[PDB]
Structure formats: structure tokens, C-alpha cells
Amino acid sequence: MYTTAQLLAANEQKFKFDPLFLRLFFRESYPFTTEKVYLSQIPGLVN
Amino acid sequence: MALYVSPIVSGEVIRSRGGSTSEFTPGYVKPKHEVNPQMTLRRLPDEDP
């Protein structure tokens, strides 16, 4: 009943989470319209 | 060099200098290659399906 409680500041507690990989090498993004995806690479070796 | 001919003898006569020639004539190169007209039927690795 008679409590008289006063609340002070709270805490935060977020992660130490920064990608460094969605920002350095994976800068380019594409959506899909198909089901599978190919990834072709031509071996460039002239004679 | 000059060496030392004394002032009593005529001395020897030097061959002046010079003479060297050469030839580097032919050279060639020709990379012929084919277009393969029947290669265009199938799909290239490019040109997304």
C-alpha cells in the first residue's frame, strides 16, 4: 500500500554488432524473379 | 695508346677505325581464328536466360 517508490535512470544493453561485411564486399544488392540462380565465369586464357 | 716513338725513327702508321654491319630482316605474325557460325545457336555463358 504505502510504498513511495521513485524510479531512476534505466539501462541500454545493446550488442557489439557491426557488419563490416554487408558494407565492404557485399555493397551491391539484387532481388529475384526466378527460382534458381546461375553464376557463370569465363576462363580467359588466350593462346 | 701512343706509346713512345723516338725522334729518330718514322714510326708506325695506325689503322684508323671502323666497320661493323648486320641484318635483321624478316619477322612475321598472323593470328587467324574462326567465328563458328553454328556456335550462335546455343546460349552463351552471358545473356541471362
Short mmCIF file of N, CA and C in Angstrom, two decimals:
data_model
loop_
_atom_site.label_atom_id
_atom_site.label_comp_id
_atom_site.label_asym_id
_atom_site.label_seq_id
_atom_site.Cartn_x
_atom_site.Cartn_y
_atom_site.Cartn_z
N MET A 1 0.84 -1.19 0.00
CA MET A 1 0.00 0.00 0.00
C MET A 1 0.88 1.25 0.00
N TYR A 2 1.35 1.64 1.18
CA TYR A 2 2.26 2.77 1.31
C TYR A 2 3.65 2.32 0.88
N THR A 3 3.99 2.58 -0.37
CA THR A 3 5.28 2.17 -0.93
C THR A 3 6.21 3.34 -1.21
N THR A 4 5.75 4.34 -1.95
CA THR A 4 6.53 5.55 -2.25
C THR A 4 7.85 5.18 -2.93
N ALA A 5 7.72 4.64 -4.14
CA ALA A 5 8.86 4.21 -4.94
C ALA A 5 9.15 5.23 -6.03
N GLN A 6 10.41 5.63 -6.14
CA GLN A 6 10.86 6.54 -7.18
C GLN A 6 11.85 5.82 -8.09
N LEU A 7 11.61 5.88 -9.40
CA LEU A 7 12.43 5.18 -10.38
C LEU A 7 13.47 6.13 -10.96
N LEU A 8 14.72 5.69 -10.97
CA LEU A 8 15.83 6.44 -11.53
C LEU A 8 16.08 5.97 -12.97
N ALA A 9 17.22 6.36 -13.53
CA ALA A 9 17.54 6.05 -14.91
C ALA A 9 17.60 4.54 -15.13
N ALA A 10 17.48 4.14 -16.40
CA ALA A 10 17.48 2.74 -16.81
C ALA A 10 18.76 2.41 -17.55
N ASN A 11 18.82 1.20 -18.07
CA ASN A 11 19.97 0.73 -18.80
C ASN A 11 19.62 0.54 -20.27
N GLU A 12 20.64 0.21 -21.06
CA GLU A 12 20.51 0.10 -22.50
C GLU A 12 20.75 -1.33 -22.99
N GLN A 13 21.97 -1.84 -22.84
CA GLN A 13 22.34 -3.20 -23.22
C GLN A 13 21.95 -3.54 -24.66
N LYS A 14 22.64 -2.91 -25.61
CA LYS A 14 22.65 -3.38 -26.99
C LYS A 14 23.93 -4.14 -27.30
N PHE A 15 23.92 -4.84 -28.44
CA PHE A 15 25.01 -5.69 -28.87
C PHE A 15 26.21 -4.88 -29.33
N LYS A 16 27.36 -5.56 -29.39
CA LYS A 16 28.53 -5.08 -30.13
C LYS A 16 28.50 -5.72 -31.51
N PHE A 17 27.59 -5.22 -32.35
CA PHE A 17 27.29 -5.87 -33.62
C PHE A 17 27.39 -4.83 -34.74
N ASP A 18 28.48 -4.90 -35.51
CA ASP A 18 28.68 -4.08 -36.69
C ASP A 18 29.12 -4.99 -37.82
N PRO A 19 28.44 -4.96 -38.97
CA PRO A 19 28.68 -5.99 -40.00
C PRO A 19 30.10 -6.05 -40.53
N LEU A 20 30.57 -4.97 -41.15
CA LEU A 20 31.87 -4.89 -41.82
C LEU A 20 31.89 -5.73 -43.10
N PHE A 21 30.86 -6.53 -43.32
CA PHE A 21 30.81 -7.41 -44.49
C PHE A 21 29.65 -7.09 -45.43
N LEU A 22 28.53 -6.62 -44.90
CA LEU A 22 27.47 -6.05 -45.72
C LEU A 22 27.78 -4.63 -46.16
N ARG A 23 29.00 -4.16 -45.87
CA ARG A 23 29.41 -2.79 -46.16
C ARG A 23 30.73 -2.71 -46.91
N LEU A 24 31.55 -3.76 -46.90
CA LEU A 24 32.85 -3.75 -47.57
C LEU A 24 32.86 -4.52 -48.88
N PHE A 25 32.32 -5.74 -48.91
CA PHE A 25 32.37 -6.58 -50.10
C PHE A 25 31.01 -6.79 -50.75
N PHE A 26 29.92 -6.71 -49.99
CA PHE A 26 28.58 -7.02 -50.48
C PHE A 26 27.77 -5.76 -50.74
N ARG A 27 28.40 -4.73 -51.30
CA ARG A 27 27.75 -3.43 -51.44
C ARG A 27 26.57 -3.48 -52.40
N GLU A 28 26.55 -4.42 -53.34
CA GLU A 28 25.56 -4.45 -54.40
C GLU A 28 24.49 -5.49 -54.10
N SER A 29 23.23 -5.11 -54.26
CA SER A 29 22.09 -5.97 -53.93
C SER A 29 21.17 -6.12 -55.13
N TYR A 30 20.61 -7.33 -55.28
CA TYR A 30 19.64 -7.62 -56.33
C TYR A 30 18.49 -8.45 -55.77
N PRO A 31 17.28 -8.26 -56.28
CA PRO A 31 16.18 -9.16 -55.97
C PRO A 31 16.14 -10.31 -56.96
N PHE A 32 15.15 -11.18 -56.79
CA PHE A 32 14.92 -12.31 -57.70
C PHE A 32 13.57 -12.20 -58.39
N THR A 33 13.49 -12.88 -59.53
CA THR A 33 12.23 -13.15 -60.19
C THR A 33 12.15 -14.62 -60.59
N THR A 34 13.26 -15.35 -60.49
CA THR A 34 13.37 -16.75 -60.88
C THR A 34 13.48 -17.62 -59.63
N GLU A 35 13.69 -18.92 -59.84
CA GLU A 35 13.86 -19.86 -58.74
C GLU A 35 15.34 -20.18 -58.49
N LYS A 36 16.03 -20.67 -59.51
CA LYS A 36 17.46 -20.93 -59.40
C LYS A 36 18.25 -19.70 -59.83
N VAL A 37 19.55 -19.72 -59.53
CA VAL A 37 20.46 -18.66 -59.96
C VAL A 37 21.76 -19.27 -60.45
N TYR A 38 22.19 -18.88 -61.65
CA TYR A 38 23.50 -19.30 -62.13
C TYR A 38 24.55 -18.26 -61.77
N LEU A 39 25.81 -18.69 -61.80
CA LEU A 39 26.94 -17.79 -61.61
C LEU A 39 28.04 -18.25 -62.57
N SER A 40 28.04 -17.68 -63.77
CA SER A 40 28.99 -18.08 -64.79
C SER A 40 30.28 -17.27 -64.69
N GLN A 41 31.37 -17.90 -65.10
CA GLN A 41 32.66 -17.22 -65.18
C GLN A 41 33.43 -17.80 -66.35
N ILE A 42 33.85 -16.94 -67.28
CA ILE A 42 34.56 -17.39 -68.47
C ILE A 42 36.05 -17.48 -68.15
N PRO A 43 36.68 -18.63 -68.40
CA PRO A 43 38.13 -18.73 -68.18
C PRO A 43 38.88 -18.04 -69.31
N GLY A 44 39.43 -16.87 -69.01
CA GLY A 44 40.11 -16.09 -70.02
C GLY A 44 41.57 -16.47 -70.15
N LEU A 45 41.87 -17.31 -71.14
CA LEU A 45 43.23 -17.81 -71.36
C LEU A 45 43.44 -17.87 -72.87
N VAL A 46 44.01 -16.79 -73.42
CA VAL A 46 44.30 -16.77 -74.85
C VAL A 46 45.51 -17.66 -75.13
N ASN A 47 45.74 -17.91 -76.42
CA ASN A 47 46.88 -18.70 -76.83
C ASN A 47 47.88 -17.81 -77.56
N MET B 1 97.69 3.37 -77.81
CA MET B 1 97.77 4.47 -76.85
C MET B 1 98.60 5.63 -77.38
N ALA B 2 99.94 5.57 -77.28
CA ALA B 2 100.78 6.48 -78.07
C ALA B 2 102.24 6.03 -78.17
N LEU B 3 102.56 4.77 -77.89
CA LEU B 3 103.49 4.50 -76.79
C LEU B 3 104.71 5.42 -76.67
N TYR B 4 105.76 5.25 -77.48
CA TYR B 4 106.98 6.00 -77.21
C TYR B 4 107.89 6.30 -78.40
N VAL B 5 107.40 6.39 -79.63
CA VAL B 5 108.27 6.54 -80.80
C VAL B 5 109.30 7.64 -80.59
N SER B 6 110.58 7.30 -80.77
CA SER B 6 111.67 8.24 -80.55
C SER B 6 111.79 9.23 -81.71
N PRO B 7 112.37 10.42 -81.47
CA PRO B 7 112.50 11.40 -82.56
C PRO B 7 113.67 11.11 -83.49
N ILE B 8 113.89 9.84 -83.82
CA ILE B 8 114.85 9.47 -84.84
C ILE B 8 114.27 8.52 -85.88
N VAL B 9 113.17 7.83 -85.58
CA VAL B 9 112.56 6.87 -86.49
C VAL B 9 111.19 7.40 -86.90
N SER B 10 110.75 7.00 -88.10
CA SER B 10 109.47 7.46 -88.62
C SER B 10 108.31 7.00 -87.74
N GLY B 11 108.35 5.74 -87.32
CA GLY B 11 107.28 5.15 -86.53
C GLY B 11 106.31 4.38 -87.40
N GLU B 12 105.30 3.82 -86.73
CA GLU B 12 104.29 3.00 -87.37
C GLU B 12 103.05 3.85 -87.65
N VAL B 13 102.23 3.38 -88.59
CA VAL B 13 101.02 4.07 -89.01
C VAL B 13 99.81 3.28 -88.52
N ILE B 14 98.92 3.96 -87.80
CA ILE B 14 97.77 3.32 -87.17
C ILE B 14 96.65 3.12 -88.18
N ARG B 15 95.99 1.97 -88.11
CA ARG B 15 94.74 1.73 -88.84
C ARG B 15 93.68 2.56 -88.13
N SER B 16 92.92 3.36 -88.89
CA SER B 16 92.17 4.44 -88.24
C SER B 16 91.14 3.93 -87.24
N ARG B 17 90.01 3.38 -87.73
CA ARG B 17 88.95 2.64 -87.02
C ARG B 17 87.84 2.20 -87.97
N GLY B 18 86.86 1.46 -87.44
CA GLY B 18 85.56 1.34 -88.06
C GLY B 18 85.24 0.05 -88.80
N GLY B 19 83.94 -0.20 -89.00
CA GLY B 19 83.46 -1.32 -89.79
C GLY B 19 82.73 -2.39 -89.01
N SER B 20 81.39 -2.34 -89.02
CA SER B 20 80.56 -3.38 -88.42
C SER B 20 79.14 -3.22 -88.93
N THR B 21 78.63 -4.24 -89.62
CA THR B 21 77.27 -4.20 -90.14
C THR B 21 76.55 -5.50 -89.81
N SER B 22 75.23 -5.48 -89.95
CA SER B 22 74.40 -6.64 -89.64
C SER B 22 73.02 -6.45 -90.26
N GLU B 23 72.25 -7.54 -90.31
CA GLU B 23 70.93 -7.56 -90.92
C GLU B 23 69.94 -8.30 -90.02
N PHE B 24 68.70 -7.82 -89.98
CA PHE B 24 67.67 -8.33 -89.08
C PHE B 24 66.33 -8.47 -89.79
N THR B 25 66.31 -9.11 -90.95
CA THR B 25 65.23 -8.84 -91.91
C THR B 25 63.81 -9.23 -91.50
N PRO B 26 63.45 -10.53 -91.47
CA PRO B 26 62.06 -10.88 -91.81
C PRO B 26 60.94 -10.50 -90.85
N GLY B 27 60.85 -11.16 -89.69
CA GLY B 27 59.70 -11.00 -88.80
C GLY B 27 58.40 -11.50 -89.41
N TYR B 28 57.42 -11.92 -88.59
CA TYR B 28 56.01 -12.00 -89.00
C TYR B 28 55.18 -12.57 -87.86
N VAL B 29 53.85 -12.38 -87.97
CA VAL B 29 52.87 -12.97 -87.06
C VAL B 29 51.47 -12.80 -87.67
N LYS B 30 50.59 -13.80 -87.49
CA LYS B 30 49.22 -13.70 -88.01
C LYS B 30 48.25 -14.63 -87.27
N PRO B 31 47.51 -14.11 -86.27
CA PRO B 31 46.53 -14.95 -85.56
C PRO B 31 45.17 -15.07 -86.24
N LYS B 32 45.03 -15.98 -87.20
CA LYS B 32 43.71 -16.28 -87.74
C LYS B 32 42.89 -17.08 -86.72
N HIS B 33 41.59 -16.79 -86.65
CA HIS B 33 40.71 -17.56 -85.78
C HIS B 33 39.31 -17.53 -86.38
N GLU B 34 38.48 -18.49 -85.98
CA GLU B 34 37.19 -18.77 -86.60
C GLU B 34 36.03 -18.22 -85.78
N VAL B 35 34.95 -17.87 -86.48
CA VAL B 35 33.74 -17.36 -85.86
C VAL B 35 32.77 -18.47 -85.48
N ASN B 36 32.82 -19.63 -86.14
CA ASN B 36 31.99 -20.79 -85.82
C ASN B 36 30.52 -20.43 -85.94
N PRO B 37 29.99 -20.31 -87.16
CA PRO B 37 28.61 -19.82 -87.33
C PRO B 37 27.55 -20.68 -86.64
N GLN B 38 27.82 -21.95 -86.38
CA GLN B 38 26.86 -22.81 -85.69
C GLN B 38 26.99 -22.73 -84.17
N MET B 39 27.93 -21.93 -83.66
CA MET B 39 28.07 -21.74 -82.22
C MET B 39 27.03 -20.79 -81.65
N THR B 40 26.38 -19.98 -82.48
CA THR B 40 25.44 -18.98 -82.02
C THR B 40 24.05 -19.54 -81.74
N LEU B 41 23.82 -20.83 -82.03
CA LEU B 41 22.51 -21.41 -81.76
C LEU B 41 22.27 -21.58 -80.27
N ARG B 42 23.25 -22.12 -79.55
CA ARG B 42 23.12 -22.39 -78.13
C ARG B 42 23.30 -21.05 -77.40
N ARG B 43 23.11 -21.03 -76.08
CA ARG B 43 23.21 -19.82 -75.28
C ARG B 43 24.64 -19.64 -74.79
N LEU B 44 25.15 -18.42 -74.91
CA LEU B 44 26.47 -18.10 -74.39
C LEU B 44 26.44 -18.11 -72.87
N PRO B 45 27.61 -18.18 -72.22
CA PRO B 45 27.64 -18.04 -70.76
C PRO B 45 27.06 -16.73 -70.27
N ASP B 46 27.15 -15.66 -71.07
CA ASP B 46 26.46 -14.41 -70.80
C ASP B 46 25.00 -14.52 -71.25
N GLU B 47 24.32 -13.38 -71.37
CA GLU B 47 22.97 -13.32 -71.95
C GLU B 47 21.98 -14.15 -71.11
N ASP B 48 21.74 -13.64 -69.90
CA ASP B 48 20.86 -14.21 -68.89
C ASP B 48 19.59 -14.83 -69.48
N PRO B 49 19.24 -16.05 -69.08
CA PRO B 49 18.09 -16.73 -69.69
C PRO B 49 16.75 -16.05 -69.42
#
